[PDB]
Design a protein around this ligand. Structure first.
Ligand code: NAD
Ligand code: NAD
Ligand code: GTP
Ligand code: GTP
Ligand code: GTP
Ligand code: GTP
Ligand code: ATP
Ligand code: ATP
Ligand code: IMP
Ligand code: IMP
Lengths: 519, 519, 103
C-alpha cells in the first residue's frame, strides 16, 4: 500500500535534526481536514464533468521526473504510459498505432474499412520493430535487380537474403542490400541477383538456437547491417537487423510483446461478419480487441464476448461503452478483461441530444471504476479529454488508462491530408456514427475539423510531462499511488462554481498567447 | 405490466447454457443502484427543463425497429405515433393536418380564422382519404364539359358519376373521368356531358350492401379507377376509388376513423362566440377539440367543457394549458379527456417575462402527468421541443404525446411562403398572441422566422427513428414500457451541471457540420 | 445531400479542379457550399420572367433585337463608380428581407 503525507513528512524529519506522539496515534499524524473525499464529492447526486471540480495539492518529497506512469490496460496487458489512441478512421491506422506504441501507449486500429485492410494495417504495426525476423522477404538468384527495387517499393525492405529456392526452406547463397543496388543505372530489369549479391562465403552468420541477446552481440561486433541465422545444414532460419537495436535505443518506453514486436489493438463490431474479421485479425497477430458500440450492455455484445472467449481464450477483450455499474456488471460477468467508459461525451458526439441517453464523464469514470476494481478490471476513460488536466483528473478518479480522439487528430500520423480550411492548416476529424461515413439512418456524430499539432512523437512527451507534474503537485509518486490515495480518502477534491471555472482560466488580459512546451 | 432488465437478462441467459438465487429473491436479481429515480430527481424542488438531466442507459435485447410507438391522445383516441402539430396559424391548416395524420400523428387546425374557414379546412382533411364516398360530386348529363373542368378546379376531383337529376339519389347514366375530357380542345363550354361520359351499360358497378373489403376486391379485379355502388332500383348510392387503396398501401401508419377518413382536431376559444364555431366544426366531422388558452384553470374554460360535454357527449375535449396538479384537478373534474401541458416554454413565447407566470417544462410534464395518471387521463407535452432527445425525455417523464410548433414550422406543408430574408430561406412563424396577428392589448408572442426543412413526410420518419433508437438505448420495447419503467423506479436519471450540458454538445472543433439522417 | 452545416440547409458545390474530387497536382477550385434553392422547375421560370422584364424595360422585343440594338449603337450604357454600385443595392435600412417571386 501507499504511505501517507503525514508518514512521508515524519520520515523526512527523521532524516534531519529538525516520543509520546507515536503512542497517541502512531504513523497517523495530524493533518487538518480540508476539501472532500471522492465518495463525498459524488454523493452529491449531480452530474460532474472534469471541469466541475479540482484536486487539492498535497506534500512533495520527490522530483516530478521520478513519477511512475505504468498502467494496466487489461487484466493481463501493462503499458509504460496511460495513453490510448481511439479507434476512429480520422485518428488511427498503422502510422498512428506505431507512433503510439513507440511512445509507450497503444493504438487500436479502426474498423471503418474491409477485414483484409484492417488485418493488413495490424500486420504493418506488428512488422515495424522485430526480434528475430522469421518470415523475411527472400528472393531467388534467378531474379533481377528490378525485382529488388519492386520489393523495396512494395514492402519497404532493402535488405533481402538470397536463397536458392527463394524461400526460408533453402540454403543461403548471398544477401542483397540497398548499398549494392543503389548506384545501378536504369538498366535494372535485366541484371541477375547473382551478379550483385554479397555471396554466402563473405557473410557473417550465426548458428540457429542462439538467444536474441547472443545474436545481438554477434551482429553488434560484426559492424554489419544484417545477421543471417542458419541451421546445421546451412539453411536460412531467420535474420536480425541493426535497425531494431537503433529503434530500441531510440524509444525506451515502447510497448512490446515477447517477440519484441509492438503491441497493436483493433476494433470489431457485434454482427455475424465480425466473426470472420476477428479470424483475420488473430492471424495478423492482434494483441487486444475492442467491441466498439455506443451502448455495450446488449445481448449482441454479451454473445460476441462469449464467442471470442470460447474460440481464442488467450486473447484480451475490452467491453464496449458503459456509464453505469449496472451495465458494467453484465459485461464483467460475461468475462471481459477491461471496459471503455463514456457515452455522449466526446468532441464530435451528439448521442445525448439525439437519443436522450448518456452520462457526465467524471461521474461515469468514478462510478464504473469503483464498481470494476471489486473484480480487478481496468477502466479506459474515453472522450472529453481536452487538456492534460483532464487526463490527470480521469486517472485520479480511478481510470487506469485514457483514450483520446480529437487530441490526437490533426497530428502528422493521423490519417488523411491537411487542406488549409480557413486561413489555418486545419485537418478533418469526423466521428464514426457521422453519416459522412457509415431505413432513416440517424446520425450520432458531426463531421468537423481540428488544428494541426505536428508529430505524436513530439506531442506525447508533452502529455507525459504534464501528467508527471500534475502527480507531483498532488504528492503522488505513481499512478497506482494516486488511485490508492483516492480510494483511501487521502486525496481531497474541491467543487467549482461557474466563477471558479472562470478564475481557473485566463482573465481580462487584452492579448493572450501561451506556448505549451519548449524542449 | 413490464419485464425488468434483470428479468430480461436472466431470460436471455436461460435461452443458452451460460439454485438458491431463486430462493433468495427470484426474478428480482441484483443490479447495482446508480443514478436517481424520477421521484428523487424532482424531489429536489428546482425547476428542471429537458436540458438539465439525462436518462441512464439500460439493457438491450431487441432491435430498435421493434419499438412500439402507439400512444393515447385522449381517454378514447389512440395514435400509431406520439406526434401532434400545434394549432398555430403559421403551423397547421389542412395541408399540415393531412400530412401529420398520414404519418400516424394528428394535426389540430388553428382558429385565427372565421368559423366557416376553419370548418372548411377540417372538411378538406376529412375528404382526403375515403372508404365509401357517400356524397360524391355528381352532375346531370345536361351539364357541359366546361362544368367538369370547373368542378376539377373547384374541388380537385376528375372522377364524376353522372346521374339524371345530378345528385347521389338518382339513376346512374354514366361516369366522366379525366381520360375522357383531357384531350378536348378549348371548345369546352359547349359540349354536353352525355357526348363524353362512359355510359351506364359499359360500367363495372357493385350492389349496395357489400362490405368495404368486398367492394375493394370488386374494384381491384375490375382494373377500373372507380367503382359505383348502386341499389336495387339502379340509383347511385356511393363510389369507391383505387386511389384510396393506393393511399392505404402508401401510408401504413395513417390515423384513421372507422369510415377510413383521416382524424382531425380543431381549436376553439372560451368565448360565447365559440359555441357557433363548435357547431360548424362538429358539422364538418371533427374528431377532437382543444380549448386553446394560456391558463386553462379558469371559470370560462370549465364552463365551456361542461357545455361541450352536455351537447356533443361523444366528442373528445382537451384541457387548456396547465403546469400544476392544482390546475389539472379542476379540468379533470370538469370532465376533459386529455390535458395540454406547458406555459412560457415555446420558442416564440414571452409570457413568463411579461406576466411573471409559468413553469419549467420538465417539472411541469412530470407533476401534471403524475397527477393525471391517477384518473387515466393522457398528457400532451407542448412547446420547447427543439430535438428528438427532448421528445424522448418528454415521453420518459410521463407525457403520452408531444405537440410541436417551431419544429414543424418552415416545412413545405406549414402555411405561408419562404421569402429568403438574409442569405437563408426563412419561412414565417409567429405565435398566436404575437400582436402581429392577435384597451392596451399586451403581446405574449414574438413574430420570428424559421429555416426551411422540406416535407413533413421526410422529416417525421426522422423523428420516429430518433424516438425508437432513444428507447433502444434505454432498453424500452414501447412507450408504455418506458413510462412503466419510470413510475417503477427502474428508469434512472442524472442531473447535468452547466459543464455537463457543454460536454454533451459539440466541443472545440473549428468547422462542424452534421447531416441529420441519410435514408 | 443537404447536411445543415451551421443553422442553414447547405448543399455541396465544388468546382471540377478542386482537388477534393480531382507531380504536385495544383488546385484551381475551392469546394464550398450553397443554401437550398428548391426545384429547377420553380426557379427557371423566375429567371425567364426576370430576363423578359429586363428586355421590356430596355425596349427590346426579343434577345435577337437586344443584340441588334447593341451592335447598331441604339443600346446605351452607363459606367458605375463604386458609390454607383452601392446606390444600386439596398441602403441604410435596419432590417431587409426581399421575397424573390410569388406566383
Ligand atoms: N461511445 C459513444 O458514445 C458512441 C456513440 C455513438 C456511436 N459510437 C461509435 O459509432 C460506431 C458505430 O457503432 P454504434 O454505436 O452505431 O452501435 P453498433 O454499430 O454496435 O450498433 C448499431 C445498431 O445495431 C444494433 N446491433 C448491433 N449488433 C447487432 C446484431 N448482432 N444484431 C442486431 N442488431 C445489432 C444495435 O443494437 C444498434 O441499434 C462505433 O465506432 C461506436 O463506438 C460511439
Ligand atoms: N401556453 C402558453 O404558454 C401560452 C401563452 C400565451 C398565449 N398562448 C396562445 O395564444 C393564444 C391566446 O391565448 P389567451 O390565453 O390569450 O387566449 P384567451 O382567449 O384564453 O385569453 C383571453 C383573455 O380574456 C379572458 N377570457 C377568455 N374567455 C373569456 C370569456 N368567456 N369571458 C371573458 N373573458 C374571457 C382570459 O382570462 C384572458 O384574460 C392561444 O392560441 C394560446 O394557446 C399560449
Ligand atoms: N534485435 C532486437 N533486439 C531487441 C529489440 N528490443 C530489445 N532487444 C534486445 O533484447 C534485450 C532487451 O533489453 P531492453 O531493450 O533493455 O528491454 P526491452 O524491454 O526489451 O525493450 P525496451 O522496453 O524498449 O527497453 C536486449 O539485449 C536488447 O538489445 C528489438 O527490437 N530487436
Ligand atoms: N530487411 C528486412 N527488414 C525487415 C523485414 N521485416 C521487417 N523489417 C524491419 O525493417 C527494418 C530494416 O529495413 P532495411 O530495409 O533492411 O534497411 P535498414 O537496415 O533499416 O536501413 P535503413 O532503412 O536505411 O535505415 C528493421 O527495423 C526490420 O526489423 C524484412 O523482411 N526484411
Ligand atoms: N372522384 C372523386 N374523388 C373524391 C371525392 N371525394 C373525395 N375524393 C378523393 O379525391 C381524390 C381524387 O380523385 P380523382 O380526381 O377521381 O382522381 P384519382 O382517381 O385519385 O386519380 P388521380 O388522377 O391520379 O388523382 C381521391 O383520393 C378520392 O378519394 C369525390 O366526390 N369524387
Ligand atoms: N377504399 C378504401 N379501403 C381502405 C382504406 N383504408 C383501408 N382500406 C381497406 O380496409 C381493409 C383493412 O385494411 P388494413 O390493412 O387493416 O388498413 P387499415 O389498417 O384500415 O389502414 P392503414 O392503417 O392505412 O393500413 C382492406 O380491405 C383495405 O383495403 C381506404 O382509405 N379506402
Ligand atoms: N551479415 C553480413 N555479412 C557480410 N556482409 C553483409 C552482411 N549484411 C550485409 N552485408 C553487406 O554489407 C554491405 C552494407 O550492408 P547494409 O545492410 O549495412 O547496407 P545498407 O543498409 O543498404 O547501408 P546503408 O544504411 O548505408 O544504406 C552490403 O554490401 C551488404 O550486402
Ligand atoms: N367503373 C367503371 N366501369 C367502367 N368504366 C369506367 C369505370 N370507372 C372509370 N371508367 C372509365 O375508364 C376510363 C379510365 O378511368 P380512370 O378513372 O381509371 O381514369 P383516370 O383516373 O382519370 O386516368 P389517369 O389516372 O390516367 O389520369 C375512363 O374512360 C372512365 O370513364
Ligand atoms: O460519431 C460518433 N458519435 C458518438 N460518439 C463517437 C463517435 N465517434 C466516436 N465517438 C466517441 O468519441 C470518442 C473520442 O472523443 P474525443 O477524444 O473527445 O474527440 C471516441 O473514442 C468514441 O467513444
Ligand atoms: O404567442 C404566443 N405566446 C405564448 N405561447 C404561445 C404563443 N403561440 C403559441 N404558443 C405556445 O407555443 C407552443 C409551440 O412552441 P414551440 O414548439 O417550442 O415552438 C404552442 O403549441 C403554444 O402552446
Amino acid at each position: 500500500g501507499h504511505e501517507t503525507a503525514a508518514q512521508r513528512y515524519s520520515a523526512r524529519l527523521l532524516q534531519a535534526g529538525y516520543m509520546a506522539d507515536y503512542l497517541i496515534s502512531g504513523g497517523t499524524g495530524y493533518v487538518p481536514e480540508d476539501g472532500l473525499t471522492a465518495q463525498q464529492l459524488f454523493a452529491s447526486a449531480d452530474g460532474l464533468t472534469y471541469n466541475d471540480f479540482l484536486i487539492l495539492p498535497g506534500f512533495i518529497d520527490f522530483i516530478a521526473d521520478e513519477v511512475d506512469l505504468t498502467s494496466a490496460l487489461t487484466r493481463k496487458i501493462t503499458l509504460k504510459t496511460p495513453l490510448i489512441s481511439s479507434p476512429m478512421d480520422t485518428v488511427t491506422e498503422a502510422d498512428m498505432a506505431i507512433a503510439m506504441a513507440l511512445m509507450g501507449g497503444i493504438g487500436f486500429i479502426h474498423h471503418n474499412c474491409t477485414p483484409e485492410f484492417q488485418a493488413n494495417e495490424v500486420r504493418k504495426v506488428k512488422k515495424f520493430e522485430q526480434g528475430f525476423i522469421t518470415d523475411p522477404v527472400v528472393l531467388s538468384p534467378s531474379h533481377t535487380v528490378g525485382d529488388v527495387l519492386e520489393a523495396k517499393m512494395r514492402h519497404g525492405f532493402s535488405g533481402i537474403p538470397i536463397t536458392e529456392t527463394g524461400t526460408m526452406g533453402s540454403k543461403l547463397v548471398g544477401i542483397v542490400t540497398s548499398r549494392d543496388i543503389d548506384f545501378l543505372a536504369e538498366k535494372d530489369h535485366t541484371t541477375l541477383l547473382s551478379e550483385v549479391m554479397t555471396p554466402r562465403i563473405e557473410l557473417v552468420v550465426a548458428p540457429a538456437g542462439v538467444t536474441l541477446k547472443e545474436a545481438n552481440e554477434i551482429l553488434q561486433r560484426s559492424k554489419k547491417g544484417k545477421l543471417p541465422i542458419v541451421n546445421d545444414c546451412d539453411e536460412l532460419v531467420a535474420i536480425i537487423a541493426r535497425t531494431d537495436l537503433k529503434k530500441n535505443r531510440d524509444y525506451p518506453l515502447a510497448s512490446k510483446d515477447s517477440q519484441k514486436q509492438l503491441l497493436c489493438g483493433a476494433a470489431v463490431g457485434t454482427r455475424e461478419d465480425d466473426k470472420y474479421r476477428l479470424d483475420l485479425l488473430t492471424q495478423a497477430g492482434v494483441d487486444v480487441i475492442v467491441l466498439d458500440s455506443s451502448q455495450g450492455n446488449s445481448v449482441y455484445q454479451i454473445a460476441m464476448v462469449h464467442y471470442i472467449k470460447q474460440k481464442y481464450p488467450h486473447l484480451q477483450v475490452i467491453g464496449g461503452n458503459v456509464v453505469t455499474a449496472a451495465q458494467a456488471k453484465n459485461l464483467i460477468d460475461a468475462g471481459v478483461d477491461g471496459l471503455r467508459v463514456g457515452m455522449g461525451c466526446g468532441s464530435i458526439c451528439i448521442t445525448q441530444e439525439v437519443m436522450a441517453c448518456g452520462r457526465p464523464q467524471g461521474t461515469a469514470v468514478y462510478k464504473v471504476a469503483e464498481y470494476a476494481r471489486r473484480f480487478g478490471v481496468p477502466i479506459i476513460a474515453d472522450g472529453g479529454i481536452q487538456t492534460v488536466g483532464h487526463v490527470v483528473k480521469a486517472l485520479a478518479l480511478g481510470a487506469s488508462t485514457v483514450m483520446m480522439g480529437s487530441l490526437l487528430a490533426a497530428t502528422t500520423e493521423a490519417p488523411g491530408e491537411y487542406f488549409f480550411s480557413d486561413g489555418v492548416r486545419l485537418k478533418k476529424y469526423r466521428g464514426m456514427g457521422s453519416l459522412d461515413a457509415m431505413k432513416v439512418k440517424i446520425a450520432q456524430g458531426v463531421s468537423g475539423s481540428i488544428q494541426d499539432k505536428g508529430s505524436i512523437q513530439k506531442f506525447v512527451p508533452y502529455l507525459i510531462a504534464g501528467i508527471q507534474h500534475g502527480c507531483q503537485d498532488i504528492g503522488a509518486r505513481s499512478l497506482s499511488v494516486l488511485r490508492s490515495m483516492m480510494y483511501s480518502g487521502e486525496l481531497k477534491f474541491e467543487k467549482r462554481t461557474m466563477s471558479a471555472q472562470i478564475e481557473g482560466g485566463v482573465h481580462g488580459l487584452h492579448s493572450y498567447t501561451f506556448l505549451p512546451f519548449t524542449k
